[PDB]
Design a protein around this ligand. Structure first.
Ligand SMILES: [Cl-]
Ligand code: NA
Ligand code: NA
Ligand code: NA
Lengths: 93, 90
């Protein structure tokens, strides 16, 4: 459910995201702006959400939203260099 | 819900937006990116939706999303000059 998934990402609620993923929710669903849970969590600086989505849920690390922003772009723009470092571990090398 | 509102704006569904507004939905509500119905409709070039929100629902014409962009910024960015001129009047 887009609304539940992206608002849980927004508030940093890893416990809810775990319950969603365990019940087979698609953790890569997108809204009308082509935003993912990983975009929203990266923009808010929620390091533990970002790690959970990347490591446990295996989401795409570089989805592009309506403006072609990736989660890495959001982390830099909003000053979350800790999130940036986690995303960097997934780069095309 | 805010997600149903912004999806109706995204698809240009003026009829759904009218039902929502008549039922007392807050047409200025924001999602987790601080986006409004007006932002999404302007980004998509939906002139009828934009006029409905501005003229009937009386929404704020210049809300700022998390990137500090307004609906006018979105219309310009996506090349919707008719929406841009409508918002300019405010
Ligand atoms: Cl604002
Ligand atoms: Na929450
Ligand atoms: Na989009
Ligand atoms: Na990139």
């Amino acid at each position: 459910s887009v609304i539940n998934l992206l608002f849980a990402a927004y508030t940093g609620d890893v416990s809810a995201l775990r319950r969603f993923a365990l019940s087979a929710m698609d953790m890569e669903q997108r809204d009308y702006d082509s935003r993912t849970a990983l975009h929203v969590a990266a923009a808010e600086g929620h390091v533990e959400v970002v790690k959970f989505l990347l490591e446990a849920c295996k989401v795409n690390p570089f989805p592009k939203d309506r403006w072609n922003n990736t989660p890495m772009d959001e982390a830099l723009h909003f000053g979350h260099h800790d999130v940036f470092k986690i995303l960097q571990e997934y780069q095309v090398q």
